[PDB]
């Protein structure tokens, strides 16, 4: 009723124990709803992904006319198909690889190259996160080796000012245990773009032309990707 200092001091304390009680679980209700929307988004992403026809992979032999493209699948027969609307036919070079429709058979999307998951394994591995500090007594040999590798892939303007083309590579010969595989860690830790590691012993097979097919497959990945390093250990085998 009236205006005291005791009852109006105890008037809100029985109320503040309710208004935060009704407010506290609201954050739990909003968070559960937010995760449920995140689960609903993934379910709707699964619904849209349910309808996928799948596209036949094939390669362009040549171009007959402005709409006629002689293509061929990987094992199947040869077709005469065209393009969708704005597929930029000037890019369709005779020897590229495309994805054909399953039913219409026409060209959906062109694909750059293949990977050959055999040599996928010679790409993805960590060297050591090493930093020119896990190596000793070799700074004459190291700096000389870094000179011929780093400078073309970083600063070719010095080679313009001289004019002279840079050379390809070096050979790490040495009696064993000296630390020759440790350098390949170092150059593939810093200033690494594309570092292939070839064991040069597993590239032989029982079939007569397969090893040569591996080598060209290794070098086309090297032209697919710009600046790249090919480390072949132990040339003494091959």
């Amino acid at each position: 009723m009236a205006d005291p200092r005791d009852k109006a001091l105890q008037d809100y304390r029985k109320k503040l124990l309710e208004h935060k009680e009704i407010d506290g679980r609201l954050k739990e209700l909003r968070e559960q709803l937010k995760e449920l929307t995140k689960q609903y988004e993934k379910s709707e992403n699964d619904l849209k992904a349910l309808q996928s026809v799948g596209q036949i992979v094939g390669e362009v032999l040549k171009q007959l006319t402005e709409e006629k493209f002689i293509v061929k699948a990987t094992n199947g027969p040869r077709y005469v198909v065209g393009c969708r609307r704005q597929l930029d036919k000037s890019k369709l070079k005779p020897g590229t690889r495309v994805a054909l429709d399953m039913t219409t058979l026409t060209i959906m999307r062109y694909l750059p190259r293949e990977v050959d998951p055999l040599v996928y394994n010679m790409s993805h591995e960590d060297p050591g996160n090493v930093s020119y500090s896990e190596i000793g007594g070799l700074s004459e040999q190291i700096r000389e080796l870094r000179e011929v590798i780093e400078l073309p892939l970083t600063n070719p303007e010095l080679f313009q000012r001289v004019g002279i083309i840079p050379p390809k590579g070096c050979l790490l010969y040495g009696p064993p245990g000296t630390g020759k595989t440790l350098l390949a860690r170092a150059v593939a830790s810093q200033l690494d773009c594309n570092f292939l590691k070839v064991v040069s012993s597993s590239i032989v097979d029982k079939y007569i032309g397969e090893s040569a097919r591996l080598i060209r497959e290794m070098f086309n990945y090297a032209r697919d990707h710009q600046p790249c390093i090919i480390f072949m250990d132990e040339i003494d085998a091959i």
Binding site: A49, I56, A73, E114
Partner: peptide, 17 residues
């Protein structure tokens, strides 16, 4: 890119589940 066991190559826009 999918290569099946019937020596048949395929391609999808989206993978799946």
């Amino acid at each position: 890119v999918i290569k099946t066991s019937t020596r048949q190559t395929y391609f999808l826009p989206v993978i799946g589940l």
